[PDB]
Amino acid sequence: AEAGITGTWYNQLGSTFIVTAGADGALTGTYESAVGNAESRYVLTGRYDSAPATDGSGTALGWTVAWKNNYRNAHSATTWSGQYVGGAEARINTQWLLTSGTTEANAWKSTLVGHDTFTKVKP
Amino acid sequence: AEAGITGTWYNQLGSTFIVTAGADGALTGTYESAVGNAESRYVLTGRYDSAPATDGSGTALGWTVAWKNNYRNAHSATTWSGQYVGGAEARINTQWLLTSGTTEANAWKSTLVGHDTFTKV
Amino acid sequence: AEAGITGTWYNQLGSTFIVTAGADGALTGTYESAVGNAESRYVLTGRYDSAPATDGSGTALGWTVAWKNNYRNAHSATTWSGQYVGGAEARINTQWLLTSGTTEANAWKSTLVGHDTFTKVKP
Amino acid sequence: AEAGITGTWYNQLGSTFIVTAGADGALTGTYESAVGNAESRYVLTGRYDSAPATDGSGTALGWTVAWKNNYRNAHSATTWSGQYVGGAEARINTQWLLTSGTTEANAWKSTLVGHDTFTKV
Numbered sequence A, C: 001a002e003a004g005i006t007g008t009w010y011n012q013l014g015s016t017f018i019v020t021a022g023a024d025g026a027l028t029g030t031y032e033s034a035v036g037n038a039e040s041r042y043v044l045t046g047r048y049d050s051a052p053a054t055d056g057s058g059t060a061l062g063w064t065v066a067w068k069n070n071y072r073n074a075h076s077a078t079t080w081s082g083q084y085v086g087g088a089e090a091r092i093n094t095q096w097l098l099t100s101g102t103t104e105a106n107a108w109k110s111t112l113v114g115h116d117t118f119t120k121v122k123p
Numbered sequence B, D: 001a002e003a004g005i006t007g008t009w010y011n012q013l014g015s016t017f018i019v020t021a022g023a024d025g026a027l028t029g030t031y032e033s034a035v036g037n038a039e040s041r042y043v044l045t046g047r048y049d050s051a052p053a054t055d056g057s058g059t060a061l062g063w064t065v066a067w068k069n070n071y072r073n074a075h076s077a078t079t080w081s082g083q084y085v086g087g088a089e090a091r092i093n094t095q096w097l098l099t100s101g102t103t104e105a106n107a108w109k110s111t112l113v114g115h116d117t118f119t120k121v
């Protein structure tokens, strides 16, 4: 449900995700991270399943942030892959990969993995 | 300057990734997977570092495909996160997460992880 | 602390982890999964940092279960990588990789990733 | 039978993995990393499927190294999870998780993920 996803969300670190779900499956918005080499808002773009299953399955989605805006550039990008689970206590449960640009010799330690849970604030 | 990310790329499974890199960091294009519950092309969108470091570092990037088009809907989405390494034989090295829409009970087994290497050959 | 790790632990799915931490850095024990193609106990072996930092850092550890015992064989193995965080509310926070044996053509979808949090029961 | 997992293997970074596979599923040996905060050999222990499927499937396995030995202590541990594929050119294909001991504040950045391919060359 585009309107189910569309809104302001926060995760367990205190980061803010503002997203709009388009009817063609597009996600666009901004992300503000509470941690890491980041300041202010960053552009995000992603995609979601705009026709999910009618049962109690979640809606699969994903989005990317490259950590460069007009104030800072961390030379890194994170992708979040997860699912939206609707209802009263709407949640988006994700796992993420954060890759930093590195020299070829340091490429083995270029990528962090983690997981974030997002809670929606009253839309 | 010199981000030769724009083009048609192929990974080791034979999937085709056609991307345009915008001057301000946007990635847009289409993806056609040679494997999985997929047929024909799917829309992708992503982001990349449009001013990378001047030392020998790769360019960080990432993108998403939701596997729904006019033919099929797999109820899943993949994100690739990696770096572009330019040069005479340019490559995009990625790790990816493929999440399927599941019930809560099956959420523990909702996400596959793998790694794809893209070259222009 | 070997004695800090040693004990019975349960995660959010209802699975049971019984572990003994050896003074040489060895972990041995048994694992019972509440989900998946598993029944009864399975042998686990792992390693941990037996001399962690004296600050508030966690103790890094990891262990493996191959899902074959005398009752069932799922032809898969999981490795958990994480850290033990001591105290009153002792926790082990992990991420895991579950690989299934597959044919070469299905090898792209061989591995699941997830995360489990373990709580210790009164030792 | 035929699990030719036992031996000395090398990955793409030039690290050396010396393993013995026990008849009942145990893996034991040593690991020497060519990269990272590591020197000399470290103890590894793991598990593998000692009765794999009879179709063309690989053998699932996994092992752990805690990066402490008599020389150094990195306060970290790596787990590799993968499958052994036998044949004329046998390979072990893995994905790994490297967790460092961190404070709670830094737990979000405690875990690296990568992938190693081992061959006997």
Ligand SMILES: O=C(O)CCCC[C@@H]1SC[C@@H]2NC(=O)N[C@@H]21
Residues within 6 Å of the ligand: A011, A013, A015, A033, A034, A035, A036, A037, A038, A067, A074, A075, A076, A078, A096, A098, A114, A116, D108
């Ligand atoms: O340090 C960087 O390279 C950029 C900031 C990264 C912030 C990460 S993205 C995953 C995790 N979730 C968050 O909300 N913030 C951190």
Ligand SMILES: O=C(O)CCCC[C@@H]1SC[C@@H]2NC(=O)N[C@@H]21
Residues within 6 Å of the ligand: B011, B013, B015, B032, B033, B034, B035, B036, B037, B038, B067, B074, B076, B078, B096, B098, B114, B116, C108
């Ligand atoms: O089966 C699905 O759910 C949709 C197709 C998934 C194809 C995956 S995405 C990661 C990997 N890289 C590819 O080029 N194809 C597979």
Ligand SMILES: O=C(O)CCCC[C@@H]1SC[C@@H]2NC(=O)N[C@@H]21
Residues within 6 Å of the ligand: B108, C011, C013, C015, C033, C034, C035, C036, C037, C038, C067, C074, C075, C076, C078, C096, C098, C114, C116
């Ligand atoms: O289905 C299988 O192949 C074997 C059982 C797998 C159980 C997994 S391991 C990770 C997760 N944590 C658990 O406690 N159980 C599941």
Ligand SMILES: O=C(O)CCCC[C@@H]1SC[C@@H]2NC(=O)N[C@@H]21
Residues within 6 Å of the ligand: A108, D011, D013, D015, D032, D033, D034, D035, D036, D037, D038, D067, D074, D076, D078, D096, D098, D114, D116
């Ligand atoms: O730096 C550390 O914390 C200890 C050494 C880590 C070496 C890693 S483990 C994964 C990868 N594969 C290797 O052979 N070496 C690196």
